[PDB]
Design a protein around this ligand. Structure first.
Ligand SMILES: CCCc1n[nH]c2oc(=O)c3ccccc3c12
Length: 110
């Protein structure tokens, strides 16, 4: 049922989604869906282009993304957003760094 390109897209998305650390913590959990403008106003003041994994998953599932590196660039913007808005001392910031590494390892393989 999946084409090669769909399959590659899915593999990159699932690698980031399913990653768990050695304690069983799923780092992606908080990245799935951005809170509202009233819930996280300071993020929307700080970030020009909001992104979350549900937005990427929808784009993937409408068979948009013409190539793998488009999806990589949307994940990279998401993690760059997280690290612009949050302080380096925060857990989400550290989590964004780890998932960014996981994303690139997957891409390096294809
Ligand atoms: C509850 C805080 C959620 C949050 N804080 N900072 C964030 O930066 C992000 O880039 C991001 C992306 C997708 C979902 C949530 C957040 C986020």
């Amino acid at each position: 049922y999946m084409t090669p390109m769909q399959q590659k897209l899915n593999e990159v998305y699932e690698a980031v989604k399913n990653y768990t650390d050695k304690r069983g913590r799923r780092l992606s959990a908080i990245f799935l869906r951005l809170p509202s403008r009233s819930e996280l106003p300071d993020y929307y003041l700080t970030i020009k282009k909001p992104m979350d994994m549900e937005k990427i998953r929808s784009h993937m599932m409408a068979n948009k993304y013409q190539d793998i590196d488009s999806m990589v660039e949307d994940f990279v913007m998401m993690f760059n957003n997280a690290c612009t808005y949050n302080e380096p001392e925060s857990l989400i910031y550290k989590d964004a760094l780890v998932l960014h590494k996981v994303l690139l390892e997957t891409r390096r393989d294809l």
